[PDB]
């Protein structure tokens, strides 16, 4: 129930640069077990509480984990324009989701 997700919002970047995607679960003491980073079509990363960061091989060239629970995109294409999602797997509350819209311009 009680707890929200704040994000970096709707942002914009030049082609070829980097962006940081950050999220922050707040207003709850429930423990974060996993966080997934996803595009509208593909999952990009998973930070596990036990086992750590895995990065989807479709983005190994261009995606560093963090800082913190965020994620850094490296060589943005206009193809990267769209929605992004940090999904918070949590106990006891459940799945919290924050959303970011990115637009890569030329």
């Amino acid at each position: 129930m009680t707890g929200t997700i704040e994000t970096t919002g709707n942002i914009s970047a030049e082609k070829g640069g980097s962006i940081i995607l950050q999220c922050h679960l707040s207003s709850t003491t429930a423990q974060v077990t996993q966080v997934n980073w996803e595009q509208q079509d593909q999952l990009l990363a998973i930070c596990n509480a036990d086992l750590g960061w895995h990065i989807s091989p479709s983005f190994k060239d261009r995606v560093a984990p963090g800082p913190g629970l965020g994620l850094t995109l490296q060589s943005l294409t206009v193809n990267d324009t769209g929605e992004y999602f940090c999904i918070y797997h949590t106990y006891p509350d459940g799945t919290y989701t924050g959303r970011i819209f990115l637009e890569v311009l030329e």
Partner: antibody
């Protein structure tokens, strides 16, 4: 119980074309990323095709790139492999596989269907 | 591409005993390494993901170790049913690549 059924295997002449089918059940086929993997008789396993949950992105190894085409129809609960310009060394049992939605690999494989490329 | 080499090719093990399998990646694959059991005539069955995490439905006598380039699957008290060819696989990057396998026979 997750179920994957492959279909379409048989003899085809070199240079020809064939099309394979995987029929899913027991899981929301549309949420899951899908693979094809192949295995020559007596030899090992070779990744051949990857596709996104909605079909937007596809990834192939150099071995088959530009000849195989992975695809899905989400309402048919079906994944397809279109094998063009076939070669002799393409002969293998072909498996479709489902990706873990908690990691980036394969949890469940079908039983396979066997392709044979010979004159 | 990332070559995964398993060793040894073959291992005969008395029942109740421990087999130890080895997968060696040609470059750092992190902990993106999975282990698969393929019984003759059967599809591969997933045993370990994330180099150490055991897939549900897998007995705890299977156990996965390693990070970096050196990975290790361990079957701590073999049973007749555990006879299969076991496969390792890295998913750090494309192309996803598999080991050559290690066949394991039951001793009697």
């Amino acid at each position: 119980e997750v179920q994957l059924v492959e279909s379409g295997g048989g003899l085809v002449q070199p240079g020809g074309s064939l099309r394979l089918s995987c029929a899913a059940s027991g899981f929301t086929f549309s949420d899951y990323y899908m693979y094809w993997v192949r295995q020559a008789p007596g030899k090992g396993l070779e990744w051949v095709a990857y596709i996104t949950k909605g079909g937007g992105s596809t990834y192939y190894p150099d071995s088959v790139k530009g000849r195989f085409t992975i695809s899905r129809d989400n309402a048919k609960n079906t994944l397809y492999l279109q094998m063009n310009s076939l070669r002799a060394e393409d002969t293998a049992v072909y498996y479709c596989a489902r990706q873990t939605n908690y990691d980036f690999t394969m949890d469940y494989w079908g039983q396979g269907t066997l392709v044979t490329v010979s004159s | 591409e990332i070559v995964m080499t398993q060793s040894p090719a073959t291992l005969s093990v008395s029942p109740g005993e421990r087999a130890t399998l080895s997968c060696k990646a040609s470059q750092d694959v992190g902990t993106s390494v999975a282990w698969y059991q393929q019984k003759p005539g059967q599809a591969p069955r997933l045993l370990i993901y994330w180099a150490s995490a055991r897939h549900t439905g897998i007995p705890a006598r299977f156990s996965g170790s390693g990070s970096g380039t050196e990975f290790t699957l361990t079957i701590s008290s073999l049973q007749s049913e555990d006879f299969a060819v076991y496969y390792c696989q890295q998913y750090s990057s494309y192309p996803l690549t598999f080991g050559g396998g290690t066949k394991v026979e039951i001793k009697r």
